[PDB]
């Protein structure tokens, strides 16, 4: 699980091959990334956003 990752900064690599720096406040068993202060990896995109598990290829702890 990502139950170790709560509130840490994270790097997400999407299946389309883009990277994002973010903070994961919450997540579900479909790896739907509930995150805030998202931005590329280089201009921010949002504070508080929802990413769908289907587009996550990979989550890394930073």
């Amino acid at each position: 699980t990502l139950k170790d990752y709560l509130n840490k900064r994270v790097v997400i690599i999407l299946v389309d091959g883009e990277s994002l720096i973010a903070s994961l406040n919450g997540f579900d068993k479909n790896t739907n990334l509930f995150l805030t202060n998202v931005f590329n990896r280089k201009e921010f995109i949002s504070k508080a956003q929802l990413l769908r598990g289907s587009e996550i290829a990979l989550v890394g702890l930073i």
Partner: protein, 88 residues
Amino acid sequence: MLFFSFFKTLVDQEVVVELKNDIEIKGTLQSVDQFLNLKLDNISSTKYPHLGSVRNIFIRGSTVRYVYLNKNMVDTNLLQDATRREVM
């Protein structure tokens, strides 16, 4: 179910995971679940995403293509008869 077992049989090991995206990643298998989602301590480059600062990663299971494993880490008669037993 079966491959959940087998993947658990491989913890504390260093494997090479290749994703569909063609990204490729070496590491120590720290955790396995049912969807086959993967966890790795000690991320390294062997095709590699541009990360230098990340230690431990969560690989979405649905996006793996290959897991590369040494012949040693595995009993082949075990897997074979297990498979022979699996129901479908």
